[PDB]
Amino acid sequence: LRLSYEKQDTLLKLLILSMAAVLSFSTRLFAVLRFESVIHEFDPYFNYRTTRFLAEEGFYKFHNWFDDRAWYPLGRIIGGTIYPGLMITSAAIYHVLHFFHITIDIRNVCVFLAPLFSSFTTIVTYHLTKELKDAGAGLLAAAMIAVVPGYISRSVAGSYDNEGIAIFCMLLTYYMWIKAVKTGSICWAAKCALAYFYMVSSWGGYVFLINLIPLHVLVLMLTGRFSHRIYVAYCTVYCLGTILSMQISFVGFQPVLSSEHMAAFGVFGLCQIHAFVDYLRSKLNPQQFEVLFKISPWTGRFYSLLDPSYAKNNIPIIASVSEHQPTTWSSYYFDLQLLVFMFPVGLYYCFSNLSDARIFIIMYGVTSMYFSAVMVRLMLVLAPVMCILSGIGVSQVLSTYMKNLDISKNEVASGMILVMAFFLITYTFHSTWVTSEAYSSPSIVLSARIIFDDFREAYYWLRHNTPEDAKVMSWWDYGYQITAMANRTILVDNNTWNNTHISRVGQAMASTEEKAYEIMRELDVSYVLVIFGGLTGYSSDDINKFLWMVRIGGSTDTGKHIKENDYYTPTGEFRVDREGSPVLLNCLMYKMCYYRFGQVYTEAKRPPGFDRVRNAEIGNKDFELDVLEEAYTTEHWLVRIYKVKDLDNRGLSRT
């Protein structure tokens, strides 16, 4: 009342912003209230085990670092193969607290760093949208960003992966570029180069930034809107950004001799070839001017995003992961509700008033949408831009219907604000439900309250009851955990940087017992860890993914007898019952995944030796492993650890 318009306005903007921030930080906090604060899934177990070694030992003792506890015979270098972004933002955030005598743990400032960086995303989004248009349509973006279900899936409290901290860097870089294009100041461009540098060091998806920018300038150059502002900004950002990007040891000399970063360069030369021509035309006349008138190819990984079928045909490892398939009508709406509708309206409102800044948002939305269409995992990029577009659209509708009200036809004018409020509420509800029920489930804690924590008990056993120089060999999926929890030297890791060693391990499985033993001697493997999952109903059994093992071991020069369409039955169906193919019933994988199993009564009224996951009886009821004596089998038979026997003493053929 008595408060002036200024004070009221700013106190409302501040209130709403603070509330949005708290909302975002307190909605990705479900996996912690239910189960204790522990990092989850296959990747966050490596980033953690690296940030920890970078905390105690100074940065200079981590830039170069040879980890001889992964790919045992080979050994992988962690110093120059990983983007050191997350580890230096977490080490710094931990060191500052220690300097302030907070003395927090390194496993507690490393779990709550995704939600914290999803509380700074809100502010950056609010500004990135307070630039394209009025503050009025900026807040409406922040709150929607706070509770966007697709983004929340990759940034819950416990997912220490460079994917909930990458979006923040992308937004900051875009805000810097938008400011540079809007104003043209050298300083702003610089402050963008720096953001790109802090983004090329944390997220492997920085090719987007050196491919949307050239696209943006090309469009701002084909329609005839290329002024000196864009020229100055682009050139400065290019130079500084590329030189900064080359610093990182992992990137090396990629920006200058690769076909992924050839866009920026081409647009640079076509920028000059344009500015100079304009200058010449200004100082000349039509008549005289008329008179005068090694590089590597597209790497398969990034090429798979263009051709959506290249993966299936050629790369037999990128198609394995579930989250590598095209998105359906049931993923877009499930993760983004009411945003999908808002996207066309936001586009239309942009296309209505083209400007230097907007022609960038439209390009980003058009590209990101297609990239999300090809692969479900890319939904990271899509949700923020869609949210920004949604913010620019609902607000416009509200603004259009906010002036018609007599206080500021009346019934029709209200009908819109009321419908919009109802849609916003429905969106908040659906977002909370999606975060709660589904996108929040601990990976290593199979639960139905009954808790199955075998994935931890077996690793702890390994870590405590094996010689300090074991060689636990398991599928590349579990490499990150075994080295962070079991603390052994797993033969294959999750980076899959050698497609012959992994093929080797594949061959060692789904083969005759002899061949397997022979392959399990060159690498000096001792223990063997297979995730049975049959007795508990686990969906992702080792047998379930055993097709990938047979299809990635028989695709190299070393082994070809393992050809597919041989483990199948005459009718080509993968049945693991008594009528299955004889070779299948004899491979090392199955032989070590159903050993002394055709006796347990898994179900009330079923044949003794039943399998819950495949709903079929076992074929090889009783057999004795020749080389693999048993060593441990967890209470629920969820993870079985065997141990390769040594060469026979008397030199007999067996064992």
């Binding site: 104003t183 050298i186 100055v232 400065t236 080359m246 000349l284 005068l292």
Partner: protein, 110 residues
């Protein structure tokens, strides 16, 4: 046959251009020449140390581009696209960008 126009253009650019702006062009030519020499020596011998030549060449392309940016902003004629960017706030910005560029060049070179 096409030299008359070139000479006329140069003459024009030697009367219609204010001082304290030609000097910028001279320094720009200097950078363009040091870059040309660098590239020529690279072609003549090839590159054993790649990061050495690459960062002893960017350290010139970046400077050249910063100089051109300063000439653009300083130019009074081009004071419609840039609003509120006084010449002093352009020179200081150029100095800051140059400092970053040189620091990174020093870090990258051997």
């Amino acid at each position: 046959s096409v030299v008359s126009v070139i000479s006329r253009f140069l003459e024009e650019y030697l009367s219609s251009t204010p001082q304290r702006l030609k000097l910028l062009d001279a320094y720009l030519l200097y950078i363009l020449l040091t870059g040309a020499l660098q590239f020529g020596y690279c072609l003549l011998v090839g590159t054993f140390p790649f990061n050495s030549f690459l960062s002893g060449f960017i350290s010139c392309v970046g400077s050249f581009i910063l100089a051109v940016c300063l000439r653009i902003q300083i130019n009074p004629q081009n004071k419609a696209d840039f609003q509120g960017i006084s010449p002093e706030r352009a020179f200081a910005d150029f100095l800051f960008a140059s400092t970053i560029l040189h620091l990174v060049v020093m870090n990258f070179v051997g």
